[PDB]
């Protein structure tokens, strides 16, 4: 049966404005494994995003971790957008600027 | 305890397209990947070959090489024979490996899921369907059990090759497996104070909101989320009556810190 992806977005180091950092988008609990993940800066696709190999958990659902260098500032927003067969439209989750 | 898990994910889109990819973990550290696109199994650590010689690794890899092609043909032939009762697409996953414990004791496992659901395991000397699995699997599993050679190979792989190989991985990877990485923490927010803790390894950790010496009971631990550099991230949140955040602190205890806990005071 299809399972819908869950998306969490969080920072590797304390987010401090102007300070280079790493933003993660962890995508979990989905099936089937085919999925398209983009990270967004001001609503536009960030080009160099790196992805972990897909893997799966004890319950058999898949997960993957995306990450990108970023420098937060108070003029930029960040998000993670996912397309999967389980959803009619892509799902976007914005970074809450704190995680 | 360390659990070594070989995770295979095979997708059959139709009669002309399939792919099989694998990843291998020892505990929470990845040790191999094996892309469909690749003839050979890739190393993700300098110690991924464990204590096996190049010759012995080649032999083990050869067996998997034969298995990967054999498995793909077996599934495609099964779908042909069942046609059109079993439609493409088909997703098969396999989780196989062993759990290593004190002394030199270990338990092995080999579980298979079909369309996301556990359906078959190897146990003892045979493949079996699990109760609840679709009845059309009974016949192909009976036929696979008549393959004595495959049964003997799997019993060797589970009962012998696995724990032996992993003993070698534990010795060769000792300094990575026993690594200590220190957490850093930060705070954010009638409301919810959040203590974020990131960068620690290994996974066990204690994070609690405190008022002085007293643990705040209402502290809720989040999920452990992985960072991309083999460390962990966790938040713990506490709902607090507005105006009464003064005097609160987040405390973090972790093996990497010694007994020097991190204490982060709110509002300060
Ligand atoms: C590898 O280890 C296997 C056991 O380990 C488990 O499975 C593997 C895959 C790993 O996942 C591991 O971590 C697991 O814990 C071991 O399997 C054992 O194989 C022997 C035969 O070689 C089986 O013995 C036969 O047992 C049946 C009775 O079985 C039923 O009852 C018992 C409890 O009483 C249950 O445990 C079983 O689940 C069954 O419900 C006997 O009827 C049969 O006796 C007949 O045959 C013998 C000759 O073997 C004659 O001497 C007798 O007189 C009878 O004719 C056997 O005794 C054993 O069931 C099986 N364990 C399990 C759980 O199935 C495997 O052999 C190892 N292989 C190698 C190469 O090391
Ligand atoms: C996962 O890995 C497995 C195992 O490696 C992959 O399965 C193998 O896939 C290869 C590549 O497709 C396949 O080789 C093909 O077999 C075809 C029929 O069996 C051949 O006819 C075909 O040759 C054509 O493509 C070649 C380039 O790939 C050309 O060099 C050759 O000239 C042929 O090109 C003509 O025909 C094509 C149509 O295929 C046409 O469009 C071209 O224009 C030209 O007319 C390939 O040799 C292996 O047999 C498979 N190996 C097995 C089964 O063991 C598998 O595909 C991977 N999965 C994914 C999704 O990537
Ligand atoms: C939609 C169905 C759901 C699928 C659930 C079924 C579970 C699938 C498990 C099938 C796994 C074995 C597939 C290959 C096997 O059938 C056989 O073709 C090959 C080839 O067999 C032939 O060669 C061997 C030696 O190479 C023996 O001589 C054997 O007797 C012979 O038939 N055997 C091996 O590669 C043995 C090692 C298997 C490891 C499996 C790990 C999961
Ligand atoms: C496939 C599980 C076998 C259990 C233990 C075997 C001992 C070492 C295996 C190491 C690398 C395995 C590579 C993945 C194979 C696959 O899933 O197709
Ligand atoms: C089977 O599915 C693949 C992957 O979705 C698709 O691209 C293609 O149409 C199919 N392959 C063939 C040879 O028809």
Curated annotation (Swiss-Prot), chain A:
GO biological process annotation, one example: iron ion transport
Disulfide bridge map: 25-80
Broad class of the protein's primary localization: secreted
Keywords for the protein's UniProt record, in alphabetical order: Disulfide bond, Immunity, Immunoglobulin domain, MHC I, Secreted, Signal
Outcome of mutating residue 85 to V: In allele W2, W4 and W5
Annotated family: Belongs to the beta-2-microglobulin family.
Protein name from the UniProt record: Beta-2-microglobulin
Span of the entire protein shown here: 21 to 119 of 119
Swiss-Prot record, chain B:
Top-level taxon of the source organism: Eukaryota
Positions annotated to bind a D-galactosylceramide: 74, 147-150
Changes after translation: N-glycosylated.
Location(s), subcellular: Cell membrane; Endosome membrane; Lysosome membrane
Glycosylation sites: 1, 14, 36, 104, 159
Domain Ig-like, first and last residues per copy: 183-266
Extracellular compartment residues: 1-266
One MF annotation (Gene Ontology) recorded for this entry: endogenous lipid antigen binding
Coiled coil ranges: none
Membrane topology, as annotated: Single-pass type I membrane protein
Summary of the tissues where the protein is detected: Expressed on cortical thymocytes, on certain T-cell leukemias, and in various other tissues.
Cysteine pairs bridged by disulfides in the record: 98-162, 195-250
Oligomeric and partner information: Heterodimer with B2M (beta-2-microglobulin). Interacts with MHC II and CD74.
Any further remark recorded for this protein: During protein synthesis and maturation, CD1 family members bind endogenous lipids that are replaced by lipid or glycolipid antigens when the proteins are internalized and pass through endosomes, before trafficking back to the cell surface.
Protein name: Antigen-presenting glycoprotein CD1d1
Organism annotation: Mus musculus (Mouse)
Gene: Cd1d1
Residues shown, of full length: 25 to 297 of 336
